[PDB]
Amino acid sequence: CVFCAKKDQAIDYKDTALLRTYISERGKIRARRVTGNCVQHQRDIALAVKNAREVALLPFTSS
Amino acid sequence: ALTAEQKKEILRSYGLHETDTGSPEAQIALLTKRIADLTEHLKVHKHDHHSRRGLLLLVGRRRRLIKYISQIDVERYRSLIERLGLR
């Protein structure tokens, strides 16, 4: 559903505003199907989120 | 690293000519290179037995190729052996 013609600029961890749309209020990981993503991008996200969390860009539990 | 540079230099020395990838000789030479790098890897860490399996398979290929050579020629056989050393 998403990431159709937007295969130019990557995301990585420099877009917490966007990734906020890819996580819960707590910051839990949304399923591929929530966004209609491709798995490649899903796992890229899974790693990105974890890294950002380890550098406290995002919390582990936004309580 | 088993890069194109390594491949080409080996083909330039052991290989027959530039566009030679079907040569038993060339293939063997490159496999022994894989043996060199990978064996060196196994000298340390001594637990990636999956890549070790990969090694053993390559050894299998090399053995079969020299067997074929044994049916094709003895001059190339001995020449190659002179380059390498069969234990």
Partner: protein, 95 residues
């Protein structure tokens, strides 16, 4: 020759005090090894999602170095031993 993105965190006070020196002091070492410095860009300071035992706010340092991996591992070693280095992350640039 191993394009790496390197991120470093610290109290912004020391960053403003040692904008360049605290960085050049080792980036030049990398150059001595034969490296390549691309950036020292800092996204100011930012609040942490959680407090790292202290310093609820820190900095967003991005370096980007295309050096030899050995030099890089030495860099990380030096920095991690430097008490002003928090949560250094180092990421590759390809598969």
């Amino acid at each position: 020759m191993r394009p790496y993105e390197i991120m470093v965190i610290l109290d912004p006070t020391l960053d403003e005090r040692t904008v360049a020196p605290s960085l050049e002091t080792f980036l030049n070492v990398v150059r001595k090894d034969g490296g390549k410095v691309e950036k020292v860009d800092i996204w100011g300071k930012r609040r942490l999602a959680y407090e790292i035992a202290k310093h609820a706010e820190g900095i967003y340092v991005v370096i980007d170095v295309k050096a030899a991996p050995a030099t890089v591992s030495e860099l990380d070693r030096q920095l991690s031993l430097n008490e002003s280095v928090l949560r250094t992350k180092v990421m590759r640039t390809d598969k």
